[PDB]
């Protein structure tokens, strides 16, 4: 199906304690493949997926240098932004950046994106056309005009439409066992009483890849988000994912409450009733 | 593969 390659960068300042913490992570779909932590031993980009160690010394050499260059911009970004909002030297603040690309099931380019946040809300974003910027406030307006002047989006678009899709494709064929597999969810259902006149029905989905899954509850046709409790999709930690959904039932009526499971690795969408 | 050209804000 669709695939993606995304990189995630967090920088957090440590006043009185030192140079900021920098963490970078690369994903293809929902498989992390590389990392860099500013606090780790090696001070290099490190592998995280089997299929990426067939890249030569050149690759790692290069990726270390680029992630250190990223680290450096973020280091400086934290100080610039502190000046932009006239904040004190004493406070710890947060920069996050995320960029990447989507391809379709022909593997041709689909979407490209580059997002930026300061203290967990949006700062500046590359718009969908990859030519222009959305700025969040007056302080980001400075950054917007600087990035217009320094031709950033030009370089970004060249990467996102080009290199980003060229390397994703390489990665996908390098990790064909790993990445091109889809694992169907192994389903399950439980039941425990809450009161005397009340029951809870819990749909379950285990061991699926990828993480995109829909679980929905419904009585008799018309679907339900009124008693519905969903948990967030959580990793099992072996590379597969898990999720559940619960509803409170006026008990005796657990005949006519049904559960819908939607996932990419399912030939048919699953209808599950409590037997 | 990472982006080659990051610029300050």
């Amino acid at each position, epitope marked *: 199906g669709s695939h993606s390659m995304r990189y995630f960068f967090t920088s957090v300042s440590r006043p009185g304690r030192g140079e900021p913490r920098f963490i970078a992570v690369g994903y293809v779909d929902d498989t992390q493949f590389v990392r860099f932590d500013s606090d780790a031993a090696s001070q290099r980009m490190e592998p995280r997926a089997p299929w990426i160690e067939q890249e030569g010394p*050149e*690759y790692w050499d*290069g990726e270390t*240098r*680029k992630v*250190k*260059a990223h680290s*450096q*911009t973020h280091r*400086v970004d934290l100080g610039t932004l502190r000046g932009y909002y006239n904040q004190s030297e004493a406070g710890s603040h947060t920069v996050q950046r995320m960029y990447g690309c989507d391809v379709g099931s022909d593997w041709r380019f689909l979407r490209g994106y580059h997002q930026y946040a300061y203290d967990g809300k949006d700062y500046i974003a590359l718009k969908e056309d990859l030519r222009s910027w959305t700025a969040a406030d007056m302080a980001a307006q400075t950054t917007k005009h600087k990035w217009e*002047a*320094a*031709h*950033v989006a*030009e*370089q970004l678009r*060249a*990467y996102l*439409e*080009g*290199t980003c899709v*060229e390397w994703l494709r390489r990665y996908l064929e390098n990790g064909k066992e790993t990445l091109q597999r889809t694992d169907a969810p192994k389903t399950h259902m439980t039941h425990h009483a809450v009161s005397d006149h009340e029951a809870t029905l819990r749909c379950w989905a285990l061991s699926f890849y990828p993480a995109e899954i829909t679980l929905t509850w419904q009585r008799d046709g018309e679907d339900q988000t009124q008693d519905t409790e969903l948990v967030e999709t959580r990793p099992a930690g072996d590379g597969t994912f898990q999720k559940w959904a619960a509803v409170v039932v006026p008990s005796g009526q657990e005949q006519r409450y049904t559960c819908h499971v939607q996932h990419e690795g399912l030939p048919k969408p699953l209808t599950l009733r409590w037997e | *593969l*990472l982006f*080659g*050209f*990051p*610029v*300050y804000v």
Partner: T-cell receptor, first 116, second 110 residues
Framework: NAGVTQTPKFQVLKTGQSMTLQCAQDMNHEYMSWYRQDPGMGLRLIHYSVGAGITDQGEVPNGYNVSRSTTEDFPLRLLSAAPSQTSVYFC??????????????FGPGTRLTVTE | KEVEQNSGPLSVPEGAIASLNCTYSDRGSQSFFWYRQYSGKSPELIMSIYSNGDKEDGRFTAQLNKASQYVSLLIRDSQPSDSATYLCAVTTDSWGKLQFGAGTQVVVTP
């Protein structure tokens, strides 16, 4: 803008003399490099500097010394000139992280001859 | 040897097409440059290309094929003042050094 300026255009030295070659850049670039060019070898990197205050060597750094005390100025100096330094020296500059349109622009050059 | 260039010297008459080739060896290269350098003076930037396909700028046309690791330069409609040596340059990032070819010397005969 003036771009990259270099000084001087031509020079002679005898074996043992010292000489500094000036270089300047107008564009708030962080990344500056010194090269030499020779008839058999093409461009070879001598030293280079990816920000103010900081510098590191390249493939041919022996006998040349470099310092980058400001963003704008990157002087190369030779302390004991030798006849293997008879060459053409070019300065070059590149934006670094400051304004990333990735092209590197060279200076006009210093043509240099050292004789016994 | 990282950047491999067209051997030279390359002689074409005036009005002709001067085609220049260049292959490189680092796959993760992301920026690509043609330089002009007349004898006696300094390398002058004439063409920058960033992604696969053709960039046209007056008489110059640079093309790029990242997949076969090849950059080219066409000089359409040649003046005799196009006689120089033409340098191929390749980089991977802001902080990765610019890799230079040896140069192809191009003579435009009248």
């Amino acid at each position: 803008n003036a771009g990259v300026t270099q000084t001087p255009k031509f020079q002679v030295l005898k074996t043992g003399q010292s000489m500094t070659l000036q270089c300047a850049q107008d564009m708030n670039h962080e990344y500056m490099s010194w090269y030499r060019q020779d008839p058999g070898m093409g461009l070879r990197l001598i030293h280079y500097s990816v920000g103010a205050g900081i510098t590191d060597q390249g493939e041919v750094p022996n006998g040349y010394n470099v310092s980058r005390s400001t963003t704008e100025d990157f002087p190369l100096r030779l302390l004991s000139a030798a006849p293997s330094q008879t060459s053409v020296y070019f300065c070059a500059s590149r934006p670094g992280l400051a304004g990333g349109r990735p092209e590197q622009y060279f200076g006009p050059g210093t043509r240099l001859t050292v004789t016994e | 040897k990282e950047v491999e260039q067209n051997s030279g010297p390359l002689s074409v008459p005036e009005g002709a097409i001067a085609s220049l080739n260049c292959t490189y060896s680092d796959r993760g290269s992301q920026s690509f440059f043609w330089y002009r350098q007349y004898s006696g003076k300094s390398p002058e930037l004439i063409m920058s290309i960033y992604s696969n396909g053709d960039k046209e700028d007056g008489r110059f046309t640079a093309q790029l094929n990242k997949a076969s690791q090849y950059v080219s330069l066409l000089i359409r409609d040649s003046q005799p003042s196009d006689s120089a040596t033409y340098l191929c340059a390749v980089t991977t990032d802001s902080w990765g050094k610019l890799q230079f070819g040896a140069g192809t010397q191009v003579v435009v005969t009248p």
